[PDB]
């Protein structure tokens, strides 16, 4: 148990407010759509699996993308190049050894040159002002997990899963802080596996009541419910693997009891 769980959590809550993408950004983009962002992120999940990257890199990459898209207009034909350079940057930040830049060229089918990927890396860094250490759903999940009684593998996996699904859909998820999404996803995963609930420990640490989580939860319960129908499926395929105790197969509950 840390001396600074508390200091870290506190500080992560300070930083997420600052590292927030604009809410309405996608409506101000002439040429791109929430549905393209979704195709883009879903693809990034596959890239993550294919190179065996950590889940945190994935989350980091989506943060970069959304902040980038919040100050720069992008054309359909460049979106994938933003994504690619984000995933590279994220890999550099978070992975022990990142894939070689060429791999990054390869995963697009040579549709951009290495030099284009390297200058978009530079452009991303400058727009983000080298501010890469963004708080994620994944980080807040990991803190929250310290408060389970007792630790439940399936719950951890299934909360991860729910957290990732939320990356896919700007849709609604853009208007929640990561600390809130991770709250909702921890509850929903808890509830789903045991019937248990968002614990007083965390109610006190986070100062989030279950009530306060209601709107996010409702949205996330919907997303969970329709997940097998969603146009994007990369995260479900990912979360079938036994690595994750197959949780994305388990049957979501059809009401939440709120």
């Amino acid at each position: 148990v840390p001396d600074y769980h508390e200091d870290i959590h506190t500080y992560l809550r300070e930083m997420e407010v600052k590292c927030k993408p604009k809410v309405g950004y996608m409506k101000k983009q002439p040429d791109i759509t929430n549905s393209m962002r979704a195709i883009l992120v879903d693809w990034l999940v596959e890239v993550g699996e294919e190179y065996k990257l950590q889940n945190e890199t994935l989350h980091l990459a989506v943060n970069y993308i959304d902040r980038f898209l919040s100050s720069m207009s992008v054309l359909r034909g460049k979106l994938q190049l933003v994504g690619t350079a984000a995933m590279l940057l994220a890999s550099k930040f978070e992975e022990i050894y990142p894939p070689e830049v060429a791999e990054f060229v390869y995963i697009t089918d040579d549709t951009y040159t290495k030099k284009q990927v390297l200058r978009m890396e530079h452009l991303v860094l400058k727009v983000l002002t080298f501010d890469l250490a963004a708080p994620t759903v994944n980080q807040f999940l990991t803190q929250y997990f310290l408060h389970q009684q007792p630790a439940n593998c399936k719950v951890e996996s299934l909360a991860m899963f729910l957290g990732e699904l939320s990356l896919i859909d700007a849709d609604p998820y853009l208007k929640y802080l990561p600390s809130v999404i991770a709250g909702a996803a921890f509850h929903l995963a808890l509830y789903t596996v045991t019937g248990q609930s968002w614990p007083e420990s965390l109610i006190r640490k986070t100062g989030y009541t279950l009530e306060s989580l209601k709107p996010c939860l409702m949205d996330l319960h919907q997303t969970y419910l329709k997940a097998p129908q969603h146009a994007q499926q990369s995260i479900r395929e990912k979360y079938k693997n036994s690595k994750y105790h197959g949780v994305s197969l388990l049957n979501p509950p059809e009401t939440l009891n709120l």
Partner: peptide
Amino acid sequence: RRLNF
């Protein structure tokens, strides 16, 4: 893949 938008 190229992403066809």
